[PDB]
User: What shape does this take?
Amino acid sequence: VRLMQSGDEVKKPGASVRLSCKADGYEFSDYFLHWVRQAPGQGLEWLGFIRPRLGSVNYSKRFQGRITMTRDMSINTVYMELRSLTSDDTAQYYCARMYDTDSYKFDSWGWGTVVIVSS
Amino acid sequence: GFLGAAGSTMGAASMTLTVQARNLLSLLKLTVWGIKQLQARVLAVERYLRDQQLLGIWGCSGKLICCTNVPWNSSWSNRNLSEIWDNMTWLQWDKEISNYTQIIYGLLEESQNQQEKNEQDLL
Amino acid sequence: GFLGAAGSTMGAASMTLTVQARNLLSLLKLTVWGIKQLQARVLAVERYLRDQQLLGIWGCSGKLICCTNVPWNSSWSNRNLSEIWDNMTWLQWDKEISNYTQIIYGLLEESQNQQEKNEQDLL
Amino acid sequence: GFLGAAGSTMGAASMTLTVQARNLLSLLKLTVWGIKQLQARVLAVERYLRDQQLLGIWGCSGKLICCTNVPWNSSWSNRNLSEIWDNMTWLQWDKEISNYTQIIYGLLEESQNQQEKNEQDLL
Amino acid sequence: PMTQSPSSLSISVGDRVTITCRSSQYAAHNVNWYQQRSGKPPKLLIYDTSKLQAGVPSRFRGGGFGTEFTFTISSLQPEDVATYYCQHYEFFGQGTRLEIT
Amino acid sequence: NLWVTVYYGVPVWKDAETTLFCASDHNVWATHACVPTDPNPQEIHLENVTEEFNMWKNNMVEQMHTDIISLWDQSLKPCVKLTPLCVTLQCTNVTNNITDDMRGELKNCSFNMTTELRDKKQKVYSLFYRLDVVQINNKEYRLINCNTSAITQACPKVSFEPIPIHYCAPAGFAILKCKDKKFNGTGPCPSVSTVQCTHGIKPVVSTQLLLNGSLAEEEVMIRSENITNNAKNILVQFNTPVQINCTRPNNNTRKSIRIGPGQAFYATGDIIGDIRQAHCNVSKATWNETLGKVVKQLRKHFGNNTIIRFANSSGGDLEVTTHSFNCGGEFFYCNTSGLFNSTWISNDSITLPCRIKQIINMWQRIGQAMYAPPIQGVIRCVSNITGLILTRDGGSTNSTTETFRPGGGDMRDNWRSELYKYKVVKIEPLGVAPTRCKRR
Amino acid sequence: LINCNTSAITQACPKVSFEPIPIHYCAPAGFAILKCKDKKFNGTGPCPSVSTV
Amino acid sequence: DDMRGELKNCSFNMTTELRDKKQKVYSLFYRLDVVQINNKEYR
Ligand SMILES: *[C@@H]1O[C@H](CO)[C@@H](O[C@@H]2O[C@H](CO)[C@@H](O[C@@H]3O[C@H](CO[C@H]4O[C@H](CO)[C@@H](O)[C@H](O)[C@@H]4O)[C@@H](O)[C@H](O[C@H]4O[C@H](CO)[C@@H](O)[C@H](O)[C@@H]4O[C@H]4O[C@H](CO)[C@@H](O)[C@H](O)[C@@H]4O)[C@@H]3O)[C@H](O)[C@H]2NC(C)=O)[C@H](O)[C@H]1NC(C)=O
Ligand SMILES: *[C@@H]1O[C@H](CO)[C@@H](O[C@@H]2O[C@H](CO)[C@@H](O[C@@H]3O[C@H](CO[C@H]4O[C@H](CO)[C@@H](O)[C@H](O)[C@@H]4O)[C@@H](O)[C@H](O[C@H]4O[C@H](CO)[C@@H](O)[C@H](O)[C@@H]4O)[C@@H]3O)[C@H](O)[C@H]2NC(C)=O)[C@H](O)[C@H]1NC(C)=O
Ligand SMILES: *[C@@H]1O[C@H](CO)[C@@H](O[C@@H]2O[C@H](CO)[C@@H](O[C@@H]3O[C@H](CO[C@H]4O[C@H](CO)[C@@H](O)[C@H](O)[C@@H]4O)[C@@H](O)[C@H](O)[C@@H]3O)[C@H](O)[C@H]2NC(C)=O)[C@H](O)[C@H]1NC(C)=O
Ligand SMILES: *[C@@H]1O[C@H](CO)[C@@H](O[C@@H]2O[C@H](CO)[C@@H](O[C@@H]3O[C@H](CO)[C@@H](O)[C@H](O)[C@@H]3O)[C@H](O)[C@H]2NC(C)=O)[C@H](O)[C@H]1NC(C)=O
Ligand SMILES: *[C@@H]1O[C@H](CO)[C@@H](O[C@@H]2O[C@H](CO)[C@@H](O)[C@H](O)[C@H]2NC(C)=O)[C@H](O)[C@H]1NC(C)=O
Ligand SMILES: *[C@@H]1O[C@H](CO)[C@@H](O[C@@H]2O[C@H](CO)[C@@H](O)[C@H](O)[C@H]2NC(C)=O)[C@H](O)[C@H]1NC(C)=O
Ligand SMILES: *[C@@H]1O[C@H](CO)[C@@H](O[C@@H]2O[C@H](CO)[C@@H](O)[C@H](O)[C@H]2NC(C)=O)[C@H](O)[C@H]1NC(C)=O
Ligand SMILES: *[C@@H]1O[C@H](CO)[C@@H](O[C@@H]2O[C@H](CO)[C@@H](O)[C@H](O)[C@H]2NC(C)=O)[C@H](O)[C@H]1NC(C)=O
Ligand SMILES: *[C@@H]1O[C@H](CO)[C@@H](O[C@@H]2O[C@H](CO)[C@@H](O)[C@H](O)[C@H]2NC(C)=O)[C@H](O)[C@H]1NC(C)=O
Ligand SMILES: *[C@@H]1O[C@H](CO)[C@@H](O[C@@H]2O[C@H](CO)[C@@H](O)[C@H](O)[C@H]2NC(C)=O)[C@H](O)[C@H]1NC(C)=O
Ligand SMILES: *[C@@H]1O[C@H](CO)[C@@H](O[C@@H]2O[C@H](CO)[C@@H](O)[C@H](O)[C@H]2NC(C)=O)[C@H](O)[C@H]1NC(C)=O
Ligand SMILES: *[C@@H]1O[C@H](CO)[C@@H](O)[C@H](O)[C@H]1NC(C)=O
Ligand SMILES: *[C@@H]1O[C@H](CO)[C@@H](O)[C@H](O)[C@H]1NC(C)=O
Ligand SMILES: *[C@@H]1O[C@H](CO)[C@@H](O)[C@H](O)[C@H]1NC(C)=O
Ligand SMILES: *[C@@H]1O[C@H](CO)[C@@H](O)[C@H](O)[C@H]1NC(C)=O
Ligand SMILES: *[C@@H]1O[C@H](CO)[C@@H](O)[C@H](O)[C@H]1NC(C)=O
Ligand SMILES: *[C@@H]1O[C@H](CO)[C@@H](O)[C@H](O)[C@H]1NC(C)=O
Assistant: This one.
């Protein structure tokens, strides 16, 4: 099971960044995909998850309104768009795959995509 | 042979039962005739099993003629034994008793259980 | 009715068995529901036949309550008969003896065969 | 285990029968394998039921070894009992009785019915 | 949320380590542990606080059922230098950094 | 002295899995093929019995899901394949007697079909909803499911009304029903009753609002495998039903087109009268009372003094963002933002503007589409919103507020609100017990 | 073709034969078939001569 | 030298997802899967 993400990005404050995550090696309908961000030198933080089966989403209360996740079944990718970027959003964003709905089990993680928001 | 004693007397018909007792049970392709044959086989198996289960519940499994300890209410039939077993066959007998069958069956099984428990008490 | 004595005492549950013994068995179109009904019928028939075969191997066919000549090792259960048959039902009994069943069954059949041979020696 | 005593002596093979008697019976999708499994289950059920029906017609249901009151015509086999039960197995015994077996069954059932009727006369 | 402690600890190779995972809400057994090597994406070792994911050596073990959970690695190895993260459902915890003494 | 004794028929069961057949008292679900259920159902109450039920690990729900999918496929098999319809349509916008709410929602598409003769064409028009056509870059449009799946026309003589079906276990099996009225869905049930058949479950297809379902008895019930978990749908069962009125005010006319020998395609002719948006109506006071009752039973798991907020769906396809259902032969997708727009701190009708789709990709199966033929006349519907399928937003900021948004899509959750109390068990009538008896 | 606006034509398949081969309808075990051997049986009523098959 | 002419670069018209539109697409077919009709015309 392989999850390849997009390429390291740099955005100005106030812009919107759309990271991607291509998943292959497993059926892209059975396991939910989460977006976990990590600030430099900080702990992991959960942004939200998406069910590729029907596109149902669930975002964290902190990043709600500023985030939107979509999926492309044919292209087999999950996209996450973050709006109104500010300085502290400089981070590495990962896409994990939950194995079972109970006992959140992030089996496979992406390589990571550092979004750098700076002026 | 099979069902030969249908018009025969009650006693004569009761004398011969195996000849019409053996014939109660005797690749796969899902064509019309294949599915019909499969349904026929399953139906025969389940009917024979139901009959044998009813026989075994009353403590009469393996016995073509089996007696029971339950009483017989005169309302079921007031006809004398001689005319029943000498001037009449099984069909019209079933016609005039078909509506008292269920309760009879219940009595049957009850007695068996009681008898079985009594045996477990005695032995 | 059916399974009514599930929570009843071991002795009281053993007293009534026919009511939950009759209900162990009771065109064809190959649609979604037809195949499910066929599978259900075959499954019921084969489960009843397996149970009756196990009963008949131990020489208890046709008997709801049947005794056996094999001994009972105290390791299976050291509980007294009074509490077993007066303050406890069949479910928790099954849970604590489920792991000694197979050997027991074997003993059962062995005795029967031995017992059978003995009559062929005596009769 | 199963069929282990196939080459064993007639008496020794007759001594052990349960081990090869239990194994005579033991969602649905209509794929290639599913229909084959359904046919196998139905075939096993009906074969076991036919064998048990033949056993129960002769008044031997539930008994692996069952005696009968019918005589044995010397034409069936003139071989002595000692050599039959000590220097020979069941396979060639079936081979050298096969064509006779078909008539003996009939005698069997007749006797049973007579015996049953006699019981109904005596009891 | 989690209160994984301590922040970091110096441990010699082969020594047994323990990381408490004092939670703030009833988590039952649904707590998992991730090992994130420096730079590499986090890797999951223990799920349900008892079971071990395939491909992970048996030296890793976990415990706890209530609001307290423990993570042990028994014999530490040079390749066990990483950060270890609690995870109950959505919430992760402050990492524990392993430094060779 | 003590010996073994074998008893046949002892009341002993173990949890197991088997095929449950159908019993009922044309249709997409083969109700006629189901066996006739007994006029007087037989149910045996059990005294002093405790069984551990688990609605979320139940197997009956999976069997029901498979059965419904199979029935749908078998009902759609022997009817018209619409492969000739995947052709370049020349579409305009309908503007004859359209209100402000339906500006451009319907398209008047004219296109060439094959006629009953192979060498002759046929220029025919039809009316396609905006959701069933995608532009190609009057303009050029094509049916939405022409590059992913083959469209099979929903077959005009079959009916989509959910006829209740009873799931009866085969002989040798029983169904334990948890009669405990405070059963949250996962755990021991003090009050267990044995039965042979289920209580006529209606195969109602809906996403955000459980329609025509079985209600609770004592109070509104909140069921979830893990309330703390945010990936688990929260089923809500109402004790009192909330009426919802559904309507398609358009007076559609069905027009038959010969697209081949015998095969006929039913298109939407010119709508006679005024074109108005299909809509739902739910009593405001009743909905507010029901939401208050839900919050009252929802604060228990999160404690008092917490803020309970209902907001609309956070995203996804049209099946999960809007309350999707099927009645009268037509499929509605209703924007339920008015329902879930409330915050709770310790005659007027909510009107929901609905949209209509004819290219239905039911059972979220990419590769098998479905064309629901137009329904003549004006469609009106009356249903009871029996329950909700909520989902809690994740994260934990400084505020203690909790936001619950409607979910759905997975029909297993829809049919788990009817099979929650049922469990299938296999009887083990053989039992060994001590007794002082020996054969003679 | 006459059946081009009402039905789809399926060609009768050349290797099959339409000759009526007699078929016997046999009831399953547990069932029997009573044949009315009365040669004056008009079709609806009692039949004095019944034979099981 | 061992695969001289064993593979054929065949270009042909297919129906697309739309019924009234065609599609000129190429492919590689082994020599055993194509027979000439009497670039050349194969089937
Ligand atoms: C929750 O549960 C409720 C109640 O159970 C349910 O509401 C019911 O929905 C069904 C949907 O099928 C409604 O049934 C339709 O009703 C209309 C109107 O019925 C009234 O008016 C007619 C006269 O117009 C009266 O005879 C009748 O008694 C009512 O007073 C009918 O017109 C419909 O009939 C068509 O469909 C039937 C089923 O397919 C056919 O048998 C029938 O012949 C009709 O089809 C044919 O005729 C059409 C017109 O000629 C033609 O266009 C067709 O192609 C075809 O040839 C149908 O019976 C029912 O009335 C609703 N009941 C109430 C009280 O509202 C909810 O839908 C449900 N919620 C869910 C499932 O989410
Ligand atoms: C749950 O409830 C929320 C409540 O807000 C809904 O959010 C609204 O959704 C509608 C529909 O998408 C939005 O309306 C659209 O606005 C677009 C412009 O938005 C800009 O500005 C907002 C802030 O005001 C930004 O967030 C946004 O990113 C944009 O920068 C228009 O371009 C759209 O126009 C389209 O529709 C009109 C209809 O007449 C056509 O005329 C146009 O040609 C075009 O097709 C549209 O008007 C609205 O802005 C959203 N509000 C907010 C605050 O974001 C959710 O949609 C709802 N979710 C459901 C029901 O599932
Ligand atoms: C639906 O009803 C169920 C039954 O009432 C609920 O399950 C119970 O939920 C409560 C509160 O959430 C738990 O109470 C906690 O218990 C632990 C100790 O755990 C005990 O149970 C586990 C079960 O595996 C056992 O392994 C342990 O050894 C303990 O015996 C305490 O430490 C906590 O402080 C707290 O009191 C119950 O444990 C739990 N029981 C079971 C069997 O699950 C369920 O939560 C309800 N669901 C909803 C959504 O309301
Ligand atoms: C079948 O056809 C439909 C309609 O053309 C395809 O859906 C469309 O797919 C394209 C990508 O090929 C999407 O374009 C993308 O749009 C987003 C904005 O939504 C934009 O940011 C991207 O850069 C990209 O341009 C398009 O949105 C999408 N349309 C819809 C309504 O979902 C579908 O993929 C086709 N099926 C296949 C190819 O299997
Ligand atoms: C949809 O378009 C069709 C074709 O343009 C319309 O049908 C024709 O409308 C013209 C208007 O001048 C009439 O003269 C014809 O008699 C109509 N029928 C045919 C077969 O051509 C139809 O009215 C349009 N529907 C709308 C706008 O709702
Ligand atoms: C149905 O087919 C006809 C003939 O192919 C189409 O009419 C042609 O359209 C093209 C493109 O506009 C013109 O270049 C031709 O001159 C037209 N020929 C004739 C005879 O009309 C027609 O457009 C098709 N129908 C639709 C709805 O597109
Ligand atoms: C749904 O509710 C709306 C608004 O309460 C109703 O709309 C009214 O409908 C009547 C009947 O046609 C009209 O006379 C009014 O002018 C409408 N008013 C408004 C503000 O729309 C509608 O009838 C209801 N429909 C159903 C099916 O419940
Ligand atoms: C939904 O519609 C029903 C009728 O289809 C409404 O209930 C009836 O309303 C009429 C008109 O006032 C009364 O005469 C009846 O007594 C009502 N009850 C029935 C028929 O059972 C109901 O109010 C509507 N609900 C809404 C709009 O939320
Ligand atoms: C669902 O309904 C809500 C309100 O009924 C819609 O929200 C309005 O959308 C219009 C269209 O852009 C905006 O002009 C309004 O400002 C919105 N108001 C509010 C309070 O949100 C929403 O757009 C609808 N969603 C759909 C149709 O997908
Ligand atoms: C098979 O033939 C096709 C012809 O289309 C070749 O594909 C084209 O080759 C030309 C060479 O000049 C390129 O400019 C095009 O970009 C190619 N693609 C298309 C779609 O035209 C293909 O290379 C050939 N394959 C072989 C010879 O192995
Ligand atoms: C695909 O179809 C086109 C059009 O039918 C073919 O092109 C034609 O080829 C014939 C034969 O040489 C010419 O007479 C026509 O003038 C061509 N028409 C056009 C519009 O180009 C084309 O050859 C077909 N593709 C293949 C691979 O055969
Ligand atoms: C989640 O639910 C399962 C099954 O009901 C249970 O075993 C587990 O303890 C629950 N966990 C939490 C945190 O509630
Ligand atoms: C037709 O409706 C579409 C929306 O579906 C709109 O974009 C377009 O401008 C409309 N064309 C008109 C009104 O001519
Ligand atoms: C929450 O408040 C209710 C009264 O509204 C009370 O019955 C209940 O015990 C409270 N729960 C607590 C304090 O945990
Ligand atoms: C719909 O149109 C038909 C035919 O004109 C008419 O008989 C019927 O009454 C109309 N229905 C409504 C609700 O207007
Ligand atoms: C559910 O809706 C139907 C149809 O509208 C109605 O007959 C029934 O009474 C409703 N349920 C209850 C409990 O009232
Ligand atoms: C193409 O290859 C075939 C063999 O498959 C050969 O007969 C023919 O001469 C070749 N044509 C060339 C090389 O032009």
About this structure: The radius of gyration of chain G is 21 Å.
